[model samples]
Structure formats: structure tokens, C-alpha cells
Target: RHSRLILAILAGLGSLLTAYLTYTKLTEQPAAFCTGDGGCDLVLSSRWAEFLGIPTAAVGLLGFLGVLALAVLPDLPLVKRWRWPALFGLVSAMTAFEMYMLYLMVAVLRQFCMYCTTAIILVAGLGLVTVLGHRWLGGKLAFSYILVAFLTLVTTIGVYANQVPPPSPLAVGLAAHLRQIGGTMYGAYWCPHAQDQKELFGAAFDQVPYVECSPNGPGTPQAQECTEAGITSYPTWIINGRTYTGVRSLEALAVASGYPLEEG
Candidate 1:
């Protein structure tokens, strides 16, 4: 009784939370916040943010709404028969997805958003409220799912570690174009993204101009060339007389440099 009541209360809250995001998605409003830079935008704009052509916010809406309806029906007598509480399964699955999204923000995009974290917390609370006072081995069974979630978290961290290369003629041309245009990438030894940025160019990384600003993070000799150029961040690319901070996709660098994506 107590669990069902809490689940419905939390479901209403979750639905409202997701509903606002859905409105934002439909209108594409404030894209700069999460859907653009800040790196949260990358996760929000990714293909995984949608399911079956419907936005994830819509899915979360339906999931929480369904869970709420099923959980509270016994008292209201809305249905002819009270078979089971569907919220248990729905919250479980949704929470699992929350775990995945959170991990993706950290490992893949290397950023996190307040909105995503809020949704995860709501779903988790909803799940926890639904799990108590149940006959289904709440002790061992609950831990098993948590263990699986942790394993999923660990596996993705290792798998998504390396990114940025498979070689393409377009990539080759982009690297050459950087030099052809006298562009430079200013970075420091402490910059991990800087390393991955170079990996995108593979052997052609040396083709473009690069400047090292600092000795590693610890004690080491640093370079002065980047200081003269007013470098403020790692892997900052100077292209077409403009500076771009953060990792640039090969396609983006090509377009930014006015180079064609195809070999031509």
C-alpha cells in the first residue's frame, strides 16, 4: 500500500519532468544549452535519444504514466480485473536506460547534464518505491540487477575508451588542408582529447602545424610558441583565421576549412 502510493506520486513527477523536455524537443528551443555545446548536447542530439521514431521524453512519459496507472488501479477500481502491477517491470527497464545514458554522458561524450541526472534520479526513486514489500526475493534479486548495471557501466568505459580513426580519404584531405591553409592545433601534454584529436589524422597528424603549450601536468619542460598565439585550451584548432576549442569531427573540420568531405 505504502509502496504503490509512493510510486504513483513519483510517477506523476517523472511524467511532468519528461513532459517539459518533450516540449523542448518538439520546438527545438534552447538548443545551445544541452543540444549544442557543453557536450551534453551531443548525447541529447545522438540517435540513442530517440526510440522507434519517438523522442525519449515521450517514451519516458508513457512509461511513468503507465506505471502510475497500473499501480494505483487496485484502489480506484478503474479496471475490471487487477491482474498485476506493471510498474515493477516498466521502472526497472527505464532505470536501466537511465544508467546507460548517464554512463554515455561520462565515457562517450565526456560530459554530464543536470536534466539527464534528474530524470535518472526520478526513475530510480520510482523503481525503489515500487520494489519494497514484495514477495520476489527483494534481497538477492535486487542486488543481482544492480550488479548487472555496474558491469554494464564498467564494460562501456573500457569499450568506448578509444575513438577517432578508421582512416578516410576525406580525413587525409582535411589534414593536408590544415597545412595548406597554414592552420595549427595548440595543445598540451595533459590534454587527452588532444591526443584523440591527433589520432583522427593518423599518420597525417604531422602534416598540420601543432604547438605544445605546457610541460606535462607535472614537472616537465613546456613550449612557448603556443603562448605567443594566445592559446587558452587544449587541442584548440586555428583554421580559416578562427579558433575552435574541443575535438572537431573530421567532417566538421573539412567543412570548416572549406574542404569537401569526399576525396573528389
Candidate 2:
């Protein structure tokens, strides 16, 4: 009886959490209680913060909202028919996605966000309660659910693998031209605009000359190059000794740097 209530409560909490995260992400504000370590900033400012051009926290908010609806609403014919299977499937898929998220934070990013960690725990609880609330289906039905979760895990990894699309030849050429022309981009490690700039070049960003102004991230001492240049903002690009601040579209970057964009 209380399993549904517990699931609803957990989903509600997750909704509030992800909603706050989405708000901060969209507003470009630092999340509260995450300032001391900068872990939240680092994670939230990374390219992974967005998936398929949408903020990941917004995606989580949608998921949590869906779960909350499923748990709280009175049962209709379809809901009564598919409630357990649907709950199991959704929460399992989410759990699989969270596993990949944790791996990225731990292995690749080498940082942790408390908000993300709390969301993971909430989803884990949802998954556990879903399983415990349902009777064992020791047959093809179980196999199907397992397949669904497995596919979700695989798809998450596949999409992430392509998150940084391989650079086109023209992008590579532009990167080289930027370097040869002494173009330098200065920004903090925890700046979303810097991440946006990097995404514009994709893998070619590796060739772009960049300086991490705040080596220890936000609120930390800045680098000498940035200090000497009197740089005051993220994603500041110096092209031909002209400084442009803020995220520049590739076309704009090409025009600013005198790189012809006709071919690509």
C-alpha cells in the first residue's frame, strides 16, 4: 500500500531537485551550497550538461515528473494493466542512465556534483521500490525488461560517444589557422560559455589555443596571461589582436578570423 506512496514521495523530491538544477543551468547561476568545492560548477558547465541540445537537468525534471504522475494518479484501464511493468521499465532505464552519468563524473570528469548524486539515489530508490512492489516474472517478460534496460545503457554510451562530433576537414583547417594566427581563447574551467565555444569546434577544439584562466576554477586566482590581457569574461577570443568576448558562432568566428566559410 505504502509502496506507491513511497515512490510518489521519492519522485516528488527528485522533481524539486532537478527543477532547481534546471533553473540554475538555464539561468547560468551557481547552484547554492555548491560553491566551496566547485564540483557542481565543473559538472554543470561541462558539455555533458546538455544532451541533444537540451539541458540534462531539464531532461531529468521531465523524467521525475512522469514518474510522479504514474505513481499518484488514479488507475485507468491502461494504467491498471501496465502499471508495474511500466514503472519497472522507466525506473530501470533511468537507473542505467545514472550509472553512465556516474562513470562520466568519476572516470572522465574526476569530479562530483551533490545534486547529481542525490538524483541518482532517488532514482535508485524508485527502482528498488518498483521491483519490490511487483511480483516476480520469471520468464520472457523478465527477459524483455532486462533487454530494455540493457539497450538504454548501450544507447546512452553510444550517444555520449558521439557527443563531440568528429571534426570536419574545414573545422580542422580553421583550428590550424586560429593557432597559426596566434588566436588565444581565455576562460575559466567552470564557464559554460567556454564549453559552448569548445562544442562549436567539436574535436577540432583540441587544436584551438586555449588558456585556463582560473586553474582552480571559479573564485580562484587567475593566470598571468589573462591578467596581462585584462580579460574579464569567459570565452574571450583574441583574433588578429582584436578581442571578442562571449560565445561566437562558427560562422562569426570564421568571419572574425578572415577564414572563408564558403567551402564548408
Candidate 3:
């Protein structure tokens, strides 16, 4: 019982801390405790950080608060009846979102944020604690709650995971025209701005292929070519074989690539 209480306290504290961070991030204010690197700034500034005008941090803050409430109020009547189900349901949902976000950060962005990853780990830990709490709770309530939580969690995650917004007609046509004219962006994973460039492509990235070139990577043709080109900075766009360095806005790139302006 004492062990359970301690675990609950720790989980509650972790959730509260995450909630506070997310709240500040959502409000477009720098977190009071963030002093490591400018990683949070870069991430929050990016388009990916916002979903339909609502900040991702806002969503995270709400989620953390929900879990924190559950952890702290386990003795409540409704909670005693359905605590495991509700708590685990939240945990599973958060875990799924965290995993997806991690995938995007690693495989897609190739950029790392220490604070973001720490929050993910905390959510995972909360899930583990919720599961352990079930053994202590016991009986039909626990069993039924776990089953419902697992099912509901999986269904909700599945629905959200498959949601993809319709492509912008302007972006689609521009990308198509670019492909016809042979435009390319040469960039490395190490550069933060390079990741921003990739986000501009959105889902069209799969259709438009890019070549990776890292100077310190294994002896590959691409790496050798980049080294020879003296490409010290990342995200060099080669439009019609003309190299342009650093981060360039989509509008700027379009104009430079000779795409005629068509106002809507």
C-alpha cells in the first residue's frame, strides 16, 4: 500500500511537471526551466507543433492533467469503480501518440529534443504504473476495466493514426511542376533548418526523392560528392542543378525555380 502511494505520488508529480511545460509551450511562452539548448524554440516555431491552430503542447497539457488527476484521486467513488480502465485508457492513448511523434522526430525529422523525449518516457512510465495498480485493485472491476481500456484505447488510436488532411491544391500543383522541371533539395540530418525544409514537402516527400550526404558517414558516393562540393551547410537546393544554400521559404523557392505566380 505504501509502495502504491509512493508510485502514485511520483507519477502525479511527473504528470504535473509535463503539464506545466506543455502549458507554457502552448501559450507561446518560453518554459521557466528550459535552459539546455534552443531545441524547444526550433520545435515550437515549426508548423508541426500546431494542429489546426491548436498547439500540440495544449493537447499534451490536457492529457498530462487527466492522468495526474487519476493518479491523485484513486480513492474517489467513480474512480474506485473504473479507475484502472480510465487511467490505462489515457496511458495507452498517450503511449500511441508518443510513439508516433517519436517516429516523426527520428525517421522524418532526424532531430532530437531532450525535453520532448523525457515527457514521452514519463508517459510510458505512467502506463506501467497504471497496469501495476490493477493487481492491487483486483476483482471484476479491475478485469473489466482493463479490457475496456485496452479496446477503447486501441480503437481511438487507430482512428487518429489514419487521419491525414487533404493536400493543398497549390502545393500539389507546385510540387508536380517542380518534378517536371527537375528540382531537388540536398540536405543533412544534422541541420535543424533542413528538417524544416522537409516539413514543407508534407506527404509529397515520398513522391519526391532526396539524396542524403553526410561528410562523416561511411565512404559512399553521395558523401564523396557532397565533400567535393564543399557543402558545409545543409539544405542546399539544386534547382536545375543550381545550388542554393540554407533555409528558403516555399514561395521563394517557387519564384526562384521560375514557377509563375498565380494568386488565389
Candidate 4:
């Protein structure tokens, strides 16, 4: 009962944390403890922030709420018999998810979110409590639960890691056309607008004509070429001696750069 109480509290805390993140994501508001250009911002704005068209935080909130219910539900016939395994399964699965998220932030994104870190730690604590509270190692049933968690982790990685879709043929063609026609995009490396434009091209962005305007990067002074060209905004696209400011979609870039859209 003591361990169950702690588990309930931990699950409730996780629920609150993920709930706040989900609300911020849904409302397009900044989350607490998120500073300018910080880890939270990166995590929130990342492509991995959502799963299957739903905010990832919302998924986490559901998981946490499930754990909370298992923790506090009355010890009815079926629940009393199955509560321990269910709790273990849920905690282990979430812990496995946290491990993947940590890898994503550290290895892939190269940024760490404070709130995400806290959630990871909280989930780990829940796993520890579940194991210690019920003496989970007394039977081989725990092994099956652990195997499910392992499968969860492996399948999750399998799903997300192999999803680097190749650049579309249209994007590659547009990039080549832009390079040939002297279409230059002047932008700072740290500019979000520039990143957005780059994302639009996917892997074909390597061929797009880009000029690094920031000398020291980010908030640093601009390069002489940027100033000489009188570029005042990020992602300033120069095509056919015409200046197009801000992020331009593929269709718009094709029209502006004179890429043939009808040609197969």
C-alpha cells in the first residue's frame, strides 16, 4: 500500500507534466522553463514532437493516466489479480520510451529539454517503485513483462529511425534548376526561416545555392555580401535579379525561379 501510494503520486505528477506540455502544444503557447532558442524550443518545434498526428505529450499524458488508474483503482477481483503485472507493464513500456527520447535528444537533435528530462526521471522512478514495491522478481511473469518492454523499445526505434524519406524528384530538380539559374538564398544559419526553407528541400537542400550571412552566426554581424546585396531579411531568395523575402514554398519557388512544373 505504501508503494502503491508513492506510485500513484508519481503517476499523477507525470500526468500533470505531460498535460501541461500537451496544452502548450495545442494552444501554440510557450511552455514554462523554456528559454529563447533553448532545448525546450527545439523539442517543441521538432518533427518528432508529434506522433500519428497527435502531440507526443498527449500520448505520454494518456500513459501516465493509465498508470495512475492502475495505482489507485479499487482491488476488485480481476484488478486485484492483475494490478501488479499491469503496473509493471505500463511503467516498463514508458521507461523504454523515455530511453528512446533521451537518445533522440542527445544523439539526433543534440539538445536536451528540461521538462523532458524531468519526465524521463519521473518515469524511471515509477519503474523502480513498481519493481521494489511488489517484489516483482519473485516469478517468471516479470520476465515476460520485461520482454514486452524490450519489444516496445525496439519497435519504437525501428519505426522512427528508418523514416528518413528520400528527397522528392521535384525537389532535386528544383534545386538543380535554381543552381543553374543563379538563384541564391541569403540567410543566417541560425535563422528559423532559413531552416524552414531548408527543410522544404529535404536532402536536395545540399544543391540549393545558399549564402551564409552571419559571420560568427546567430546574432553576430552580417557578412559583407549580405549587406552589399541589401538583404534585410532571412531566407531572401534572389532569382533572375528579383528579390523574394521569407520562406517560399516549392510551387512558389518554381514559379519565381522559372522551373518547368508541367514537365515530367
**Against the correct fold, how does model 3 do in TM-score?**
0.60
Q: Candidate 4, residues 22-51: lDDT per residue as tens digits?
A: 887898854321224523565556656767
Candidate 3 per-residue lDDT, tens place, 99-137, comes to 767876777655667667877887777666666665653
Residues 1-264, candidate 1, lDDT per residue (tens digit)? Answer: 545677777888888988988887788753211211433544465545655567878988998788877766764453434323344456666777787787767776555667778889888787677667355644666775676556645653434343334666677777878888987888754354665677677887878788777755323444678777776566788888887887887888887789865447
Q: In model 4, where do residues sit more than 4 Å from their true spots?
A: 29-39, 138-146, 161-166, 186-196, 211-236, 241-247
Candidate 1 backbone collisions, by pair: 34-41
lDDT for every model? 0.67, 0.79, 0.62, 0.79
Which parts of model 2 are misplaced by more than 4 Å?
25-39, 137-146, 161-170, 188-190, 214-220, 261-264
* 28 Cα displacement, candidate 1 (Å): 2.4
Q: Tell me the deviation in Å of residue 40 in model 3.
A: 9.2
Per residue, candidate 2 scores C-alpha lDDT tens digits across 37-99 of 444676756777787777888888888888888888787678877777777778878887898
Residue 50 lDDT (model 2): 81
Candidate 1 overall lDDT versus native: 0.67
For model 4, the run of ten residues with the poorest summed lDDT: 30-39
Task: Flag the better candidate by lDDT, 2 or 3.
Answer: 2
Error of 4 at 174 (Å): 0.3
Clashes of each: 1, 0, 0, 0
**Candidate 3 regions off by >4 Å?**
2-4, 16-58, 73-85, 98-117, 134-167, 176-182, 189-196, 202-211, 215-224, 227-232, 238-250
Which candidate order results from sorting by TM-score in descending order?
4, 2, 3, 1
Using lDDT as the yardstick, the better of models 1 and 3 is 1
